[PDB]
Amino acid sequence: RPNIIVFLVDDMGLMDTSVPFIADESGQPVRHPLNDWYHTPNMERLAKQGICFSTFYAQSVSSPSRASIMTGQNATRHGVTNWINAESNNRNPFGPPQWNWKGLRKDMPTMPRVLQQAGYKTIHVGKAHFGCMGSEGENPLNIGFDVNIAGSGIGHPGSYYGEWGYGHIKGQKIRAVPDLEKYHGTDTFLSEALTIEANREITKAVEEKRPFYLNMAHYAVHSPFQADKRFLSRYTDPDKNEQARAFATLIEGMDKSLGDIMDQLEKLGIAENTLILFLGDNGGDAPLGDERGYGSSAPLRGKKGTEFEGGMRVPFIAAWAKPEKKSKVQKNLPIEVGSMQTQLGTIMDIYPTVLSVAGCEVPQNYVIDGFDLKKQLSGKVDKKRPESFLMHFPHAHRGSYFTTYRMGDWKLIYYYLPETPKQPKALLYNLKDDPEERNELSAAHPDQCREMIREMSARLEKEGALYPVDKQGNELKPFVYF
Ligand SMILES: CC(=O)N[C@@H]1[C@@H](O)[C@@H](OS(=O)(=O)O)[C@@H](CO)O[C@H]1O
Ligand SMILES: [Ca+2]
């Protein structure tokens, strides 16, 4: 039975790496300027041994994505449609009153809980953000983890600096990272402290002779953008401000962590037995350019928390830590080494892919929104899964009170506009012809737009979505307004 590592980077979009995730018309990687700015040599090492997905969808912000990864359910269905504010219910003015602020529940068959039931040692390290303060989900031990280092209801760290006690000595006390007291006062960067702790848990799992699931959930690369002195000297582009250079150092330190975990697997002799899934949790938050133009994920439009592709396009790499044709466990999930997969995947697809390789099954009667990636991981187009992603955000952020719906080449953006709830607005893009969202064409294809609204409307109902409300609590369902 294989070990599984989900290496999840906070606020890391598809361009925040030296690995090119943009595909040309031949399905081959194309280098863009951000790929020559970031330095992720261990991601390059992992891409050499595995498969990159060029189109991989997450939700637009943290808790919705982290809920979706744990449950295999869309944010419509698990109900965590906003990032969770630990201290108070952040519905936002027009948010659904019954949205799942409390978060993941002790009774949910989460990926870790199903693995734990099967005898896996399940380890959580770093950012959890599965529940509010005082909730079941605040504590990863309540949703199927045997071990939690540094996870709580917090969604970012009080500091990256060990000298600042990660918030306990200096910085934001109410976001102080827990469980790392032995690093306080030292010059150990938060991302380094988490790596040391993860490698200690991996070592302990191997000596106990149990297969493990490691949720390596970095606080990197979320603000505050506090530069790592180990890497800052490499970042000197005159058109990148101090914040962007700090962000680049959080990326490079994240990549060092990935390398130290891969080295530890090789040192223990278990690399042949360990699957690594690498992704970000939502659209990239790099402090570059213009938030609703081109910057954080150029050449794609937008940023973390927007309705654009930059809001929800994350990097995704799957690789055996040491590929080996002889390996029994690798025959259950063969990966085309050094290749790019251009067919769409989503964070809901992780649940069914991991449970199958682990020798478990998706519980037959548990309704999921994910598809086993086995066929796509071999480097083939999988006709058993749709080219579709539905990103429901009935809350306030860089974009507000919207649903996006992608079906094949087409993307609908529906704005509920709760302040003028009788006059909603729909936009239409052809992402095949216009991947940078430059050519809004609802006026030119009014029937494609009408059809997408009906399909999206039916899918929101099928998934049990909670809708935004107007000032007086009237439920705002999408409708063909024209
Ligand atoms: C504009 C922006 O990005 N705001 C983020 C918010 O989205 C959330 O981050 S999130 O990664 O959890 O979604 C929160 C976590 O405490 O931190 C804020 O700074
Ligand atoms: Ca995030």
Strand order in the sheet with 50-53: 147-149, 121-126, 212-218, 3-9, 274-280, 316-320, 50-53, 339-341
**Beta carbon of 11 within 6 Å of any ligand 1 atom:** yes
**Beta carbon of 61 within 6 Å of any ligand 1 atom:** yes
Nearest CA to ligand 1 atom 14: 155
**Beta carbon of 304 within 6 Å of any ligand 1 atom:** yes
| Residues tagged in the binding site annotation | 10-11, 281
CATH number for the domain running over 3-377: 3.40.720.10
Q: Which amino acid is at 273?
A: N
Nearest CA to ligand 1 atom 19: 223
Strand order in the sheet with 425-430: 388-393, 402-407, 410-415, 425-430
Q: Which of 16, 61, 225 to mutate to test the pocket of ligand 1 (most atoms within 8 A of CB)?
A: 61
Cα 103 to ligand 2 centre (Å): 16
* DSSP single-letter state for residue 439: -
**Beta carbon of 66 within 6 Å of any ligand 1 atom:** no
CA distances from 53 to 7, 179, 330, 347 (A): 15, 34, 19, 12
* DSSP per position, 208-272: TT--EEEEEEE-TTSSS----TTTGGG---TTS-HHHHHHHHHHHHHHHHHHHHHHHHHHHT-GG
**Beta carbon of 83 within 6 Å of any ligand 1 atom:** yes
CATH architecture of the domain with residue range 401-462: 2-Layer Sandwich (3.30)
From 260, 231, 261, select the one nearest 246 (Cα to Cα): 231
Domain 3-377 shares a fold with domain 401-462: no
In the chain, what are the domain boundaries? 3-377, 401-462
In Å, what resolution does this model reach?
Answer: 1.9
Please compute Rg for the chain using Cα positions.
21
Phi, psi at 158, each rounded to 5°: -65, -25
* DSSP single-letter state for residue 303: -
Method: X-ray
